[PDB]
Design a binder for this molecule. Structure first.
Ligand SMILES: CC(C)(Cc1ccc2ccccc2c1)NC[C@@H](O)COc1cccc(Cl)c1C#N
Ligand SMILES: CC(C)(Cc1ccc2ccccc2c1)NC[C@@H](O)COc1cccc(Cl)c1C#N
Ligand SMILES: *[C@@H]1O[C@H](CO)[C@@H](O[C@@H]2O[C@H](CO)[C@@H](O)[C@H](O)[C@H]2NC(C)=O)[C@H](O)[C@H]1NC(C)=O
Ligand SMILES: *[C@@H]1O[C@H](CO)[C@@H](O)[C@H](O)[C@H]1NC(C)=O
Ligand SMILES: *[C@@H]1O[C@H](CO)[C@@H](O)[C@H](O)[C@H]1NC(C)=O
Ligand SMILES: *[C@@H]1O[C@H](CO)[C@@H](O)[C@H](O)[C@H]1NC(C)=O
Ligand SMILES: *[C@@H]1O[C@H](CO)[C@@H](O)[C@H](O)[C@H]1NC(C)=O
Ligand SMILES: *[C@@H]1O[C@H](CO)[C@@H](O)[C@H](O)[C@H]1NC(C)=O
Lengths: 785, 777
């Protein structure tokens, strides 16, 4: 393809897919290689270039009086078919200076990354610029290795640093990764694995896909996708690289996932067929921004081979389009496009070169853009002047937006984010635009998404739930790591020690003493303070039993005091019964210390009242016999016997008093307000001295059991000693068996039992002789001995 | 400039005369100019002089290429792609629309894959001499590439097998950014997985790296503990981080080299020795070029017409060839022999073209080419079919892909005391002819580690740990890194390394040492234990005195001491004494099933019969007929209890390992505790019954105050019964059974203290006739 002009532009296009791979034996002269598979889509691209050139030469508003001509060759998407053309561009630029008439001014560049990489090395010698329409490899973006390379497609790596941001507008963690087994899939997954760990995103699985892979490895990948519990899968792959794979996943029929798409396959019709009716439906993809061209659907239609000479490929496109032959409107992916996404790139690149030449044509002679303010002339233009202007480009394409090439050479633009909503008239995979992204601006304003229009899971509406672990409910903590990566966690129930209220907490928290948890680790309610309480009816029942004995003792005092020097009273010593009656009068009241909540002073002196009361009671009844008794020596002996325990009580209360302790060691819910005894021997001495005195009076009472004197008093004294040792021996098993808030109850019942036991035996019969109907025969002063 | 001489057939050439180019950012405000090259290289000039010498020799030898003269055209490469492409255009220019026949070139490897693409279109052959990358091996992408240096796919496997010969685990790597480094290090990372080694850190350096990148690389190499760092890179690329590391005085690392920088005077300097010393690297095979030292000293910049790189060279060496430089200081010829060999390879190609008779056919239908009009596509056909006997005497032929196989040599650096130049003494050969696994060989006493270290260094991630402990715990790390934790008691390890400790045998508990475990001890009072022989002696003495009292009762009979009481009823007390004395022996020894079965009943029946003998002895409230039945009924009311539990719940022997781990304890089981409390209560009740009558009849003086003595006997019995309970509650094993029998022994003597003792005092002493008097009592 070649038409003359004042300024000549080069061009490379992939009209044929691939070459015929013969094995040269080189027995004869080598021959030129053949190309085999015809590309219709590449022919649509070349028609876009011829349309752009005819538009610029038809208008006078841009580049007047300068007819532009093209020279276009067919790369067969191989390097060897490309450099043979590049040696035809490069020649008349500087061949007379290399070796001891049109000149190419720019090249509209090559599709595959390897082809452009090979061509740009040769074109970097002579500083002839090159704008590309499809090359998206990262390594081309070096200004150091390649001097002159410009792109009208943005860099692929930005897709990866776009892609993580979509996740962080929806707040997910768990994700899976599929990459193509190619040169395109590995930079994308490497950069994504960088940015994910940078943004704390954990990836479940990494897999590879190819046309060359076996069906068994595809089955392994199918098992990996079905087994793993991840709701999003990133795919960096080319269009043909999925054609078996999505078909065999449709064989499995999984319909839960929502997919994420790279730029190559997001708009690929080879990755979306209506057989893939709903199972792929709901995904999100990075398309390329498409804008209409007027006239181009009439310019494609108006081609015919023997009518237009300058397009050399028409003579073969006629013959292989519909299968005809020649002597020198139908179903094809030539006419049947529905989005212009690369054809628009070719049209835009040809206008890029057009406005660069315009800025050379109209710069004022005063302030140029070169050394010492001089413009370059237009009828003697060289390549380096055009390159210098072409970095500084800022103009309005007819769509409306600005275009300015970046410092690295990329074109600043907006990736479009699409969703696939099944059009109810169409019933096929139909794309719908939802969100848009900006690579050039700072982070935080790159990505806006309106979420009301996107539909995950086909007809579903709600955001999927794809963390590694479902977050733990209230009453638990975030738990320890389980050997999975750090985004994962387990759920652990809180102990009964502490509570958990705020959701997804790391550790539980405590609370005060006398506040222990309820169940579920809700919070810390109050504990139970368990004391033998007057609010309970059992305590006031015990108090009534205590008061009744005091009243009966007072009656005994009344009948004692009224009858003096009377024949029942006069025999036994008159002060003796008076001293005996006060012993009962205080021993009855002494039981009241063991009821209610223990205060410390009442906890302190409770045992000495017991000790003093029973010591003087047992002493005064032991000195009452008058057989082994004879100033009142009985009174002095009682004083000595009482003071010999009073010394024990004063010493024990001055060296180590008992303490009042809230023993919480018994149970968490119920605390026990009790008393620590202090010195154990101090309580043991007061326990034993009373027992020894009781044994002594028991021995002196039993030795005169039969002898009558004042109505068998020795027998009743023996009975009193018997009931005393009986209740004292019945307290200790009861003491061991009894649980708290009843050991005080067992104590006061035992004291009450001993109290009426020592009350009744001594005095009831004498009360009967003073009170029953034969009292007159009971008391005779000579008699009744 | 360039080198040129006219001839009938011309050859190309590319040689890296300058190391690198000035990195000038281009303004593009003016004419873009041609960049200059930075720092001059002498070694490249020696290589170029080797090629000019080979061409002069071929031109002057009349047996090879007769009567036709070969010329040459050389351009320098400056080790960058741009100057190379500008040169290959000037080769290729005429053929598209004098013609170069071959190109002996592409010293670098990045340059190689561009010059091959641009020469592959026209089918001009290309013979490399130093490019060793593997991507250029295939003959589908590159039609006409041929190497005379071996491929590096052997080198990665050699760098793997050196680890297995020196037994290492932890190693880290860095590579060059070009096609020389990264494919080879991918190959070695592939071959590393089989050998079960661990790769810690991989980093990448290019020659034009900034200060921040080499700062980061020094940080990574400083942090990890790997001694062995493998570097698969060129000469000038590694130079910046060498500047940085020797500025920081890092001293511990051991380096393991590639082919390219293993012998380079750019790095091997006296000033860098305290880092890069002692390293190990591959050097290629030697060669012999005669007549070449003289031809090196025959350069003269006025007389040097045809060469054009002479004059610049003079301005680098003197600003009369005895000045220290790497142009004439070469120990061996390693790469210059390859360039000489490549020029003879093309020479024999054209010689065979000159000698094909018509019948031999290598073109079309058996037709031969012609020398007058020779094309670059025919020389490729003779290049694929080549053999000649080179001047040494081996045979040269190319493989299908293009490489030439050869053995390498591994060398280890040193420091000679003469002038401190780092001297390259060899250690080993790597013969690639033989099978995989019988190639490498390292003589050890010559190889000398960095800092003249005799010992082989340690380079494992984890210390393989002691025989006491065990190692099997991997916390997500690579498997070479592992941890050692002390296995629990009951389990010990008896081998140098294992995943887990085996359980110690039973009747043994694991030692503190954890190397081996020794057996426990059963703790029990024993018959051969002399402390127990004391108790056995007491038992024997008590039995002997019981026999003494019985014999006194036998022979001193008819006496009023004896004849007042019931003469049979005395014998029951003696047999009771013998029985209760004999019953104490069942607690001495290791308890068995029979002993644990019958320990209690013998004591029960013996003591019951003993008390039953003295219940009805007193005949104050008691009077063959009556007393025999009185004993018999209370004997029955204990033997029924005994047979009841000995048929219901026999207590048995029990070995408790519960109390102490290092010493087990053997004791009889409790065995129906009610069926022992019942016997104890029965005994105490029968004791209280006689104690009541003894307290009642205390004052009555009869038969030497018999009732009073009975009261003291019962008092002594209750005294030792009270004394038993804290002694039971206090003592531990091997003592609670000792006190038990001891208590029984005490009680036994108490009976013989009171019952038949003081009466014997009348009978043996002076009161014998007084005791033998029927009037008495
Ligand atoms: C009042 C008392 C001393 C026990 C008490 C109770 C009732 C009685 C009725 C009649 C006559 C004496 C009585 C003595 N409070 C002490 C108690 O806390 C502790 O109890 C004990 C605890 C351990 C050991 C012993 Cl040995 C005792 C007693 N004893
Ligand atoms: C032999 C004996 C039955 C205890 C014994 C020891 C010496 C004695 C000396 C004179 C007369 C009787 C004696 C009884 N071995 C069993 C012992 O382990 C168990 O002991 C007890 C265990 C719990 C409660 C009691 Cl109340 C006892 C007794 N008792
Ligand atoms: C750690 O060092 C030891 C010895 O220094 C090596 O490990 C084993 O050593 C024995 C002894 O010859 C060999 O039989 C084994 O084959 C070695 N195992 C491995 C995996 O090499 C080796 O140098 C290092 N081993 C590890 C696991 O790091
Ligand atoms: C394209 O990106 C620019 C840069 O911020 C923005 O101003 C513009 O609105 C975007 N347009 C579309 C259609 O996305
Ligand atoms: C997923 O985890 C994020 C934290 O990274 C959290 O904010 C979000 O609520 C979680 N989504 C769930 C559990 O659905
Ligand atoms: C590792 O390297 C970093 C910088 O590369 C440094 O800050 C750090 O101290 C080093 N050591 C450790 C143990 O992290
Ligand atoms: C070269 O010649 C010798 C001579 O017989 C032969 O042994 C050798 O194999 C030949 N090399 C080939 C055919 O590659
Ligand atoms: C390499 O070294 C071995 C060692 O003897 C030698 O026999 C062999 O010839 C050498 N060359 C090759 C190509 O193996």
């Amino acid at each position: 393809a070649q038409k003359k002009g004042d300024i000549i532009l080069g061009g490379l296009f992939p009209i044929h897919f691939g070459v015929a791979a013969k094995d040269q034996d080189l027995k004869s002269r080598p021959e030129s290689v053949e190309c085999i598979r015809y590309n219709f889509r590449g022919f649509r691209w070349l028609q876009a270039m011829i349309f752009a050139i005819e538009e610029i030469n038809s208008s006078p508003a841009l580049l007047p009086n300068l007819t532009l001509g093209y020279r276009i060759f067919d790369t067969c998407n191989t390097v060897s078919k490309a450099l043979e053309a590049t040696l035809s561009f490069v020649a008349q630029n500087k061949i007379d200076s290399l070796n001891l008439i049109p000149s190419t001014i720019a090249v509209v560049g090559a599709t595959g990354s390897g082809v452009s990489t090979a061509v740009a090395n040769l074109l970097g010698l002579f500083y002839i610029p090159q704008v590309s329409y499809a090359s998206s490899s990262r390594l081309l973006s070096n200004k150091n290795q390649f001097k002159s390379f410009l792109r009208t497609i943005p860099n692929d790596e930005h897709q990866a640093t776009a892609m993580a941001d979509i996740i962080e507008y929806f707040r997910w963690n768990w994700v899976g990764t599929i990459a193509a087994d190619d040169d395109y899939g590995r930079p994308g997954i490497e950069k994504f694995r960088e940015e994910a760990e940078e943004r704390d995103i954990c990836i479940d699985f990494s897999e590879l896909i190819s046309q060359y892979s076996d069906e068994e490895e595809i089955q392994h990948v199918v098992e990996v996708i079905q087994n793993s519990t991840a709701k999003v899968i990133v795919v960096f792959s080319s269009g043909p690289d999925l054609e078996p794979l999505i078909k065999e996943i449709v064989r499995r029929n999984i319909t839960g996932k929502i997919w994420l798409a790279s730029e190559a396959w997001a708009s690929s019709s080879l990755i979306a067929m209506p057989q893939y009716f709903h199972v792929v439906g709901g995904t999100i993809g990075f398309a390329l921004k498409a804008g209409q061209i007027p006239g181009f659907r009439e310019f494609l239609k108006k081609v015919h081979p023997r009518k237009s000479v300058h397009n050399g490929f028409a003579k073969e496109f006629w013959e292989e389009t519909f299968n005809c032959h020649l002597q020198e409107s139908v179903e094809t992916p030539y006419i049947d496009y529905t989005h212009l996404r690369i054809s628009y790139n070719v049209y835009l690149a040809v206008y890029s070169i057009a406005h660069a030449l315009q800025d050379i044509y109209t710069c004022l002679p005063g302030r140029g853009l070169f050394t010492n303010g001089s413009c370059a002339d237009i009828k003697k233009v060289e390549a380096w002047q055009v390159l210098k202007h072409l970095r500084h480009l800022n103009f309005t394409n007819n769509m409306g937006e600005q275009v300015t090439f970046d410092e690295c050479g990329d074109l600043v633009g907006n990736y479009s984010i699409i969703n696939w909503h099944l059009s109810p008239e169409d019933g096929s995979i139909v794309f719908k635009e939802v969100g848009y992204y900006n690579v050039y601006a700072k982070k935080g304003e790159r990505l806006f998404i309106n979420e009301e229009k996107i539909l995950w899971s086909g007809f579903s509406r709600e955001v999927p739930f794809s963390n590694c672990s479902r977050d733990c409910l209230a009453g638990t903590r975030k738990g320890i790591i389980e050997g999975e990566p750090t985004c994962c966690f387990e759920c652990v129930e809180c102990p009964d020690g502490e509570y958990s209220d705020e959701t997804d907490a790391s550790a539980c928290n405590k609370c005060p003493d006398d506040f222990w948890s309820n169940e579920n680790h809700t919070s810390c309610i109050a504990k139970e303070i368990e004391f033998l309480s007057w609010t309970e009816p059992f305590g006031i029942a015990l108090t009534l039993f205590a008061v009744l004995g005091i009243f009966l003792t007072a009656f005994v005092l009344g009948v004692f005091i009224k009858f003096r020097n009377t024949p029942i009273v006069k025999a036994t010593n008159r002060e003796l019964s008076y001293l005996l009656l006060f012993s009962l009068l205080c021993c009855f009241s002494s039981s009241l210390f063991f009821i209610g909540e223990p205060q410390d002073w009442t906890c302190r002196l409770r045992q000495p009242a017991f000790g003093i009361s029973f010591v003087l009671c047992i002493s005064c009844i032991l000195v009452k016999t008058n057989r082994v008794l004879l100033l009142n020596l009985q009174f002095l002996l009682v004083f000595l016997c009482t003071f010999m325990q009073i010394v024990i009580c004063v010493i024990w209360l001055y060296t180590a008093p008992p303490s009042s302790y809230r023993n919480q060691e018994l149970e968490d819910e119920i605390i026990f307000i009790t008393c620590h005894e202090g010195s154990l021997m101090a309580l043991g001495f007061l326990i034993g001295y009373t027992c020894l005195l009781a044994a002594i009076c028991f021995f002196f009472a039993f030795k005169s059991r039969k002898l009558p004197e004042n109505f068998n008093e020795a027998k009743f004294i023996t009975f009193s000693m018997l009931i005393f040792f009986i209740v004292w021996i019945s307290f200790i098993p009861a003491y061991a068996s009894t649980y708290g808030k009843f050991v005080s109850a067992v104590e006061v019942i035992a004291i009450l039992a001993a109290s009426f036991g020592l009350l009744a035996c001594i005095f009831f019969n004498k009360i009967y002789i003073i009170l029953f109907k034969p009292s007159r025969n009971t008391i005779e002063e000579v008699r009744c001995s």
